Design a protein around this ligand. Structure first.
Ligand SMILES: *[C@@H]1O[C@H](CO)[C@@H](O)[C@H](O)[C@H]1NC(C)=O
Length: 165
C-alpha cells in the first residue's frame, strides 16, 4: 500500500524545528529518505528511491559532511536532525583534503559508519576523507563533484591508508 515518511526541507525551518510532518510515498516504488549535506547546510526528508535500500551512505572530510539514508518503515527517516556530531567516532582515522597533497593532508577521526579511507579524483579536483563502503561504490562521489567530470575512486580499510603518496 502506502508508506508514511517524515517530511521536511531546509528551504523552510521544517527540518530544524517544529512538529514532525508526514508524507505518503508509493511503496515499493518509493521509500523514506533523508539526505544531509553540511559544509551549504542542505537537509531534506521525504520520499525517494535509492539503490541499496534499506541502508545508509556517508562521507566526511574536515569541512564537508554528506549522509544519506533510505528505509521502509513508518517515519523511519524521522527523529532528531543529524549532523556529523550525531555519529560517535568509530576508531579509524583518515587523511582529509578538499577539491591537496602530502604537504598538508591532515588526519581526521572517522565517525559512524564512515570507516573506509577514501581518495577520489575528478577529471582536476581531489578529495580524501572517511566514507562508508556504499559511498565508495555507489554513484554518490560522482554527484557532489562540480559538474560532469570523470570520477575514479579508491577506498581502503585501515587507519591512514589513504595518505598522499
Ligand atoms: C579543520 O578545518 C579547519 C579549517 O576550517 C582548520 O582550521 C582546522 O585546523 C582543521 N582541523 C582538523 C582536525 O582537521
Amino acid at each position: 500500500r502506502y508508506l508514511e515518511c517524515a517530511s521536511c526541507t531546509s528551504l523552510d525551518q521544517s527540518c530544524e524545528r517544529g512538529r514532525e510532518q508526514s508524507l505518503q510515498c508509493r511503496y515499493p516504488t518509493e521509500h523514506c529518505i533523508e539526505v544531509v549535506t553540511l559544509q551549504d547546510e542542505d537537509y531534506t526528508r521525504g520520499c525517494g528511491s535509492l539503490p541499496g535500500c534499506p541502508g545508509t551512505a556517508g562521507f566526511h572530510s574536515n569541512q564537508t559532511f554528506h549522509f544519506l539514508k533510505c528505509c521502509n518503515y513508518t517515519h523511519c527517516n524521522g527523529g532528531p536532525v543529524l549532523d556529523l556530531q550525531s555519529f560517535p567516532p568509530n576508531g579509524f582515522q583518515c587523511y582529509s583534503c578538499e577539491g591537496c597533497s602530502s604537504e598538508e593532508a591532515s588526519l581526521i577521526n572517522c565517525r559512524g559508519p564512515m570507516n573506509q579511507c577514501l581518495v577520489a579524483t575528478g577529471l582536476s579536483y581531489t578529495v580524501r576523507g572517511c566514507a562508508t563502503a556504499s559511498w565508495c561504490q555507489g554513484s554518490h562521489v560522482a554527484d557532489s563533484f562540480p559538474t560532469h567530470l570523470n570520477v575514479s575512486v579508491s577506498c581502503c580499510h585501515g587507519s591512514g591508508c589513504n595518505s598522499p603518496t
